[PDB]
A paper describes a structure:
Despite the high degree of similarity of CH3 domains, T1 unexpectedly showed a formation of homodimers. Visual inspection along with detailed interface analysis with PDBePISA showed that the hydrogen bonds involved in the IgG4 CH3 dimer interface were absent in the T1 dimer. Instead, a small set of hydrogen bonds involving amino acids Thr350/Leu440 and Gln355/Glu356 were formed between the chains, indicating a possible breach of the monomeric Fc formation. Upon inspection of the newly formed T1 dimer interface superimposed with MFc2, we observed that one of the mutations in MFc2, namely, Arg366, had shifted position in its side chain. This shift allowed for the Phe351 from each chain to “reach in” and form a hydrophobic stacking interaction. Although analytical methods showed a relatively well-behaving T1 protein, the crystal structure suggests that despite the extensive disruption in dimer interface, there remained a possibility that at high protein concentrations the engineered Fc could be engaged in dimer formation. The crystal structure of the T1 protein suggested that the engineered Fc could be engaged in a newly packed dimer formation at high protein concentrations.
Past efforts to engineer a monomeric Fc, defined as one set of CH2 and CH3 domains, have proved challenging due to the extensive interactions to be disrupted in the CH3–CH3 dimer interface.
Author numbering: 235 to 444
Write the structure that this text describes.
């Protein structure tokens, strides 16, 4: 007992769905001693070692330990195809090296439906109105939701964490809040929903206007 632990994190959902972008797997080593700061990383893709990993300069934590992070770029298709990413961590503080493995959630991809809603009758008596965008029937839970007004990014939104449904699929909600006037003056609002099961990972949704 004692000595370093390793934790392994998947890429960011949006990074996995936009081929334009660079998905990364991230290996984090904590409880590295002040004595043996140095950490070697070995990465594997379905068991075969890869060398493109970038290790970040180690960082001193307040509890008198070092934290060391290695970041492995992965290919759009490899990650989505369930390739297996292993992070092996060697330190003089460990008798023998430590492994973790991650891949995408196992299972049968399901395309979501997106339902868009103007504000409820009871909301239309308020200074501020909400525009709701409901996503249900997606598997896995990896997804990206975003809002534009007249193709410009809109930032006053909140998106629930996907919730598991009865049939195994996931459901979530996204709400964008704007001045009643902006809605009434007839501006257009778009929910942008990306999921792997959607064709080109671009889900179709109807824009909202009065
Ligand atoms: Zn080699
Ligand atoms: Zn793709
Ligand atoms: Zn389809």
């Amino acid at each position: 007992l004692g000595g370093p632990s390793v934790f392994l994190f998947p890429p960011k959902p949006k990074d996995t769905l936009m081929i334009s972008r660079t998905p990364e797997v991230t290996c984090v080593v904590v409880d590295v001693s002040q004595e043996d700061p140095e950490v070697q990383f070995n990465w594997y893709v379905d068991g075969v070692e890869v060398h493109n990993a970038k290790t970040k300069p180690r960082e001193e934590q307040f509890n008198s330990t070092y934290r060391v992070v290695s970041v492995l770029t992965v290919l759009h298709q490899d990650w989505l195809n369930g390739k297996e990413y292993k992070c092996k961590v060697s330190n003089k503080g460990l008798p023998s090296s430590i492994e973790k493995t991650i891949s995408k959630a196992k299972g049968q991809p399901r395309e979501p439906q997106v339902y868009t809603f103007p504000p409820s009758q009871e909301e239309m008596t308020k200074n501020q109105v909400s525009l709701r965008c409901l996503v249900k029937g997606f598997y896995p839970s990896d997804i990206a939701v975003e809002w534009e007004s007249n193709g410009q990014p809109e930032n006053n939104y909140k998106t629930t964490k996907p919730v598991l449904d009865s049939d195994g699929s996931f459901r979530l909600e996204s709400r964008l809040t704007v001045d009643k006037s902006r809605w009434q003056e007839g501006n257009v609002f778009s929910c942008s929903v990306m999921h792997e099961a959607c064709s080109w990972h671009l889900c179709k949704s109807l824009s909202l206007s009065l």
